[PDB]
Amino acid sequence: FDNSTYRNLQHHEYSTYTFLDLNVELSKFRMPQPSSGRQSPRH
Amino acid sequence: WSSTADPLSNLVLTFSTKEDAVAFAEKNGWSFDVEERKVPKPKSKSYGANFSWNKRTRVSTK
Numbered sequence: 001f002d003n004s005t006y007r008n009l010q011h012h013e014y015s016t017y018t019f020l021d022l023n024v025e026l027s028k029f030r031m032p033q034p035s036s037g038r039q040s041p042r043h
Numbered sequence: 044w045s046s047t048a049d050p051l052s053n054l055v056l057t058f059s060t061k062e063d064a065v066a067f068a069e070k071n072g073w074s075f076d077v078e079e080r081k082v083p084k085p086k087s088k089s090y091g092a093n094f095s096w097n098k099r100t101r102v103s104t105k
Contacts, residue, residue, distance in 0.1 A: 041101040 058064035061077060068075040092100040 036097040038097065041095075041099055041103070 056064070056067070058067065061080070065075065065077065092098070093102045093105075095101045
């Protein structure tokens, strides 16, 4: 154990699409969304 | 200029009720037409309805 080293270095290799790629990856883990019963408030 | 020949073109009288006006018109011999008072009907205003979960009352802008 030691406190000398900084351990938050993975964000140095994040690209323009990292957040949305993670969202695409997370898409398969989610529960089915609720529905209001119509396609939009204008329907 | 705009010219007129009837002396009553600017005559407007004010009354508290419809019955007072009718009585005044009758005692002066004037034929009259009475139109009933128009009041706006009471309305149901709900601010929260602007953000409805499943209704069309949801607004798209503020």
